[PDB]
Amino acid sequence: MSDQHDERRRFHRIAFDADSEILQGERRWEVLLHDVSLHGILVGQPQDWNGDPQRPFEARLYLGLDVLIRMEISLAWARDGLLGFECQHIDLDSISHLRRLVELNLGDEELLERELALLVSAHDD
To answer: Site (Important for c-di-GMP binding): which residue positions?
Structure first.
């Protein structure tokens, strides 16, 4: 249709204003999303929980009350407050929302096609 639509630039980075809850059935930990992809997700926790890669975690992204993104993940590595999870089961409809949002903003699906070790926070040292 057209690119020029916003005064700003649509997020060309994977970080949305969504309620990100990483839970495990009974235990909920609200967290801030830094970048999420098809291979994994990097969040930032200013509070350390248990920290066990043997414990699979649930990533529930409330993009809206009616717009729920869901994905079953496992803790791959936790380091310096940055926790990189590996994706196990992202729901088809969930992916449909995620990819559609990227498409909508024209953020390039390239971001989803990196490797978890390549996914760093907005600030790099």
So the answer is: 40
